[PDB]
Design a protein around this ligand. Structure first.
Ligand SMILES: Nc1ncnc2c1ncn2[C@@H]1O[C@H](COP(=O)(O)OP(=O)(O)O)[C@@H](O)[C@H]1O
Ligand SMILES: [Mg+2]
Lengths: 55, 371, 66, 55
């Protein structure tokens, strides 16, 4: 009819916005966790270098 | 006073006062002289019916569009259309209102100069300004970057913009548009027996295209499905009865957009001229253009095009970039809404081409600083 | 920029839906029930006209039959 | 009718799914970010003690 189509369009705009936000948040999590794990690896290498210096 | 935001277009003239949401009067731009003899006396028969009046008497007229591909080929008819638009559809004399026409990119200069000369001499407006049809469609989306594909009815053009700085070397204008799709649909309907020839029946084929055709997500699978089942055959009632059944002509008509080899055009589809337009841009603004691809214009209203185009570009583009296609529901009037917004701005109020300036430099003022 | 999208979108996101629902409800209420009732009324009047026509036709055929 | 109900329910389900997924992703992002900050803070002190050891 008439109002039904507009209501469907609203329900679809919510769909697109929610899905896009979810995808963007997932990409953010991937990037942040990669950052953290690379920092942890750098910390490990520093520990090993400290061990060599102690030797 | 208020400004008149006219938008000539090619196929539908959209006009209205600046500052509203939708154009006040939208009507086809056709001027049709009668072609038969006429025997009733005193019937009050005019010599040319323009606008929406000639879509009701089209049975005995020979409609002819005054704008072929963006450019204007018949200046007298265009003047008649403008006169009708000002006096009968809006009923505001042009002597007291600025006007904001719109023009496709890469159009001949003489067209624009003649347009401004007409507006200043015949209608005698206070001040008029000509704007590129894609920047307005970018205004209406509320963005400031993005690459807009404005597939009108006359010409499809693809203007990329970043941070408000247009890139003049990356505009890809292609002359396939809604009219060629109408002609191709009228040409493939003959494969079932329905022959439309008269210039009046082109309107019927246009209505068929608007109401039935859709863009297939995958072309070969649809061609295979329509050739086995019969779940696609949708029927339609002509203006006199004798319903017709459209089979796989439904998604073959708008497929011409992505494969212009169907109508013999050499160039690549609208899915690949956008990617080429992006790749001509600098290497650092390609991500933003990928993420803010904007659709506009009437012909981009086919059901299922915002998914086919996204699939195609995602196939072409690098796998890391995110491809997003902005397809607002108010696509058809996007250019005019943007025009209203631009005319309503205070910062823009001193960019009009004032009449005294035209009197001092002639019609060639439009190419000058007042663009 | 991009701050008028809220003030031009969120408005009609609810007001338009509610107003169109109101319009549909009022139009259906005004239209469907009244039309069915009026058609039933006209049908009853039509049946009465049919009875009157039958009576008049029969009496005239009775008299005129010679 | 029938189609309106199923389509509306499916679309609302899609919106809710995307929203909850985004919230989970953002929570993990915040936790990973704070842990990364901890890693930075500890790494600076590790570098300082390494420098003293080297001296
Ligand atoms: N709902 C629709 N579905 C498919 N095609 C449409 C629809 N509406 C309009 N069109 C096509 O778009 C054309 C109108 O385009 P428009 O944007 O008015 O052109 P212009 O840029 O000259 O204004 C029509 O000729 C028609 O072929
Ligand atoms: Mg246009």
């Amino acid at each position: 009819m008439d109002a039904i189509k507009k209501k469907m369009q609203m329900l679809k705009l919510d769909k697109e916005n929610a899905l896009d936000r979810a995808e963007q948040a997932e990409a953010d999590k991937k990037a942040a966790e990669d950052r953290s794990k690379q920092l942890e690896d750098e910390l490990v290498s520093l520990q090993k270098k400290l061990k060599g210096t102690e030797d | 006073t208020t400004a008149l935001v006219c938008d000539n277009g090619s196929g539908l003239v959209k006009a209205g006062f600046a500052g509203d949401d939708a154009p006040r009067a939208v009507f086809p731009s056709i001027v049709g002289r009668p072609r038969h003899q006429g025997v009733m006396v005193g019937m009050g028969q005019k010599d040319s019916y323009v606008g929406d009046e000639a879509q009701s008497k089209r049975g005995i007229l020979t409609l002819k569009y005054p704008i072929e591909h963006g450019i204007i080929t018949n200046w007298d008819d265009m003047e008649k259309i403008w006169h009708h638009t000002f006096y009968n559809e809006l009923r505001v004399a042009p002597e007291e209102h600025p006007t904001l026409l719109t023009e496709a990119p890469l159009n001949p200069k003489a067209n624009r100069e003649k347009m401004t000369q007409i507006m200043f001499e015949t209608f005698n407006v206070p001040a008029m300004y000509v704007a590129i049809q894609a920047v307005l469609s970018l205004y209406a989306s509320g963005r400031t970057t993005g690459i807009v594909l404005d597939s009108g009815d006359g010409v499809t053009h693809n203007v990329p913009i970043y941070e408000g700085y247009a890139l003049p070397h990356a505009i890809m204008r292609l002359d396939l548009a809604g009219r060629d799709l109408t002609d191709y649909l009228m040409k493939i309907l003959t494969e079932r027996g329905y022959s439309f020839v008269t210039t009046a029946e082109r309107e019927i084929v246009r209505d068929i295209k608007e109401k039935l055709c859709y863009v297939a997500l995958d072309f070969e699978n649809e061609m295979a499905t329509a050739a086995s089942s019969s779940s696609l055959e949708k029927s339609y009632e002509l203006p006199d009865g004798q319903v017709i059944t459209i089979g796989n002509e439904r998604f073959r008509c708008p497929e011409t957009l992505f494969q212009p080899s169907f109508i013999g055009m050499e160039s690549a589809g609208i899915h690949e001229t956008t990617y080429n337009s992006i790749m001509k841009c600098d290497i650092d603004i390609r991500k933003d253009l990928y993420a803010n691809n904007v659709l506009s214009g009437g012909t981009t209203m086919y059901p299922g095009i915002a998914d086919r185009m996204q699939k195609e570009i995602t196939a072409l583009a690098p796998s890391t970039m995110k491809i997003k296609i902005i397809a607002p529901p108010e696509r058809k009037y996007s250019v005019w809404i943007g025009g209203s917004i631009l005319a309503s701005l205070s910062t823009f109020q001193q960019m009009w081409i004032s009449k005294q300036e035209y009197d001092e430099a002639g019609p060639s003022i439009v190419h000058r600083k007042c663009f | 920029d991009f701050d008028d999208i809220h003030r031009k979108r969120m408005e009609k996101d609810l007001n338009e839906l509610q107003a169109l629902i109101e319009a549909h409800f009022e139009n259906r209420k005004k239209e469907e029930e009244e039309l069915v009732s009026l058609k039933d009324r006209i049908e009853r009047r039509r049946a009465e006209r049919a009875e009157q026509q039958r009576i008049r036709n029969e009496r005239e055929k009775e008299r005129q039959n010679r």
